[PDB]
Ligand binder design. Structure first.
Ligand SMILES: NC(=O)c1ccc[n+]([C@@H]2O[C@H](COP(=O)([O-])OP(=O)(O)OC[C@H]3O[C@@H](n4cnc5c(N)ncnc54)[C@H](OP(=O)(O)O)[C@@H]3O)[C@@H](O)[C@H]2O)c1
Ligand SMILES: Cc1ccc(S(=O)(=O)NC(=O)NN2C[C@H]3CCC[C@H]3C2)cc1
Length: 315
């Protein structure tokens, strides 16, 4: 159950989301990554930002050592954080991710976000009035350094995340482009279905990878507590009743049938195992149209500061 990427590599269509907020002890990521692998997940999404690559990498080594999987059975994604966009910083950022995880390579490396931040050791650099410090970087140069990570064998595939159409075209029209982005990992769910971006991506052989596909973790630091709770949506619950599944399963299946590769974060053993049942049933064309009607241009992530950034993707 994979999709063929535009560089000839294969991505599993269901991915495991690994981010958990800092109140969750770091040992949990180790435990639940093992559980996801045990359940059947093979595509695993992490990032430098998530402060978990060591734990996720150790789960993977653990499941290889005990004979459940081989390295080449696992599709592992990491991401370049926005403080490392300057081209000279890209390779060392990846090498550090690889060292942490103890892998020789990632299956996929992404530019996490187009919103460049000031180089340094803070993930979130701020000035003397507490304002986040943006950086200005030609992302075409970042991308060239990404291509070099691929040729260097350190990333089998390269792509982007949180790019809008204009940003994607800037890469696609770059003079001397060697590798297209294989994907664009973006927020995508029935309340924000991205159909326009998705059709653009499809026209360019670029895979759209959905995050917050289950409505996000509703973290009080970035998500308005008054936003509607996706999985309480009454169309989603009535489809769940109809198919005898769950609303999460409806949300995940929706993405698969529209050609979207979908991530699903759970740190709960039974929900982890539930999510792999997405492959067991199908929505009707009329179900899919019903879900398509739910879009409300709702993005769960908000930060007013990021909105002023010149590369803010929702400009
Ligand atoms: N590129 C980016 O900028 C970006 C941004 C955000 C996320 N991501 C990636 O995408 C992953 C997923 O997105 P997300 O973290 O926003 O979460 P999500 O996949 O939208 O899931 C949100 C919540 O749904 C719950 N859930 C999972 N399965 C369930 C089921 N079957 N029934 C009921 N509830 C269920 C989980 O809680 P429990 O843990 O309690 O089950 C989870 O906290 C992330 O972990 C990360 O890998 C990338
Ligand atoms: C510190 C922290 C913040 C947020 C999250 S998270 O929001 O749960 N997950 C995620 O990957 N990153 N964010 C979405 C992107 C758009 C803007 C910049 C990026 C940040 C995890 C960890």
């Amino acid at each position: 159950q994979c999709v063929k990427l535009n560089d000839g590599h294969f991505m599993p269509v269901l991915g495991f989301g690994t981010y958990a907020p800092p109140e969750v002890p770091r040992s949990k990521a180790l435990e639940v990554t093992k559980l996801a692998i045990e359940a059947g997940f093979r595509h695993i999404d992490s990032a430098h930002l998530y402060n978990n690559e060591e734990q996720v990498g150790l789960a993977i080594r653990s499941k290889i050592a005990d004979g459940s999987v081989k390295r080449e059975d696992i599709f592992y994604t990491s991401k370049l954080w926005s403080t490392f966009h300057r081209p000279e910083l890209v390779r060392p950022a990846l090498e550090n991710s690889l060292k942490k995880a103890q892998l020789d390579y990632v299956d996929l490396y992404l530019i996490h976000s187009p919103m460049s931040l000031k180089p340094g050791e803070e993930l979130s650099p701020t000035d003397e009035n507490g304002k986040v410090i943006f950086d200005i970087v030609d992302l075409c140069t970042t991308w060239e350094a990404m291509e070099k990570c691929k040729d260097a064998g350190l990333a089998k595939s390269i792509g982007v995340s949180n790019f809008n159409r204009r940003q994607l075209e800037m890469i696609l029209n770059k003079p001397g482009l060697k590798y297209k982005p294989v994907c664009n990992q973006v927020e995508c769910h029935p309340y924000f279905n991205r159909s326009k971006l998705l059709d653009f991506c499809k026209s360019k052989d670029i895979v759209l990878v959905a995050y917050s596909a289950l409505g996000s973790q509703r973290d009080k630091r970035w998500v308005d507590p008054n936003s509607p709770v996706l999985l309480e949506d009454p169309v989603l619950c009535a489809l769940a009743k109809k198919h005898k599944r769950t609303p999460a399963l409806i949300a995940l299946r929706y993405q698969l049938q529209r050609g979207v590769v979908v991530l699903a974060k759970s740190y709960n053993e039974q929900r982890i195992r539930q999510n792999v049942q997405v492959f067991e049933f199908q929505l009707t064309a009329e179900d899919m149209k019903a879900i398509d009607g739910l879009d409300r241009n709702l993005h769960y992530f908000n930060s007013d500061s990021f909105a002023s950034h010149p590369n803010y993707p929702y400009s």
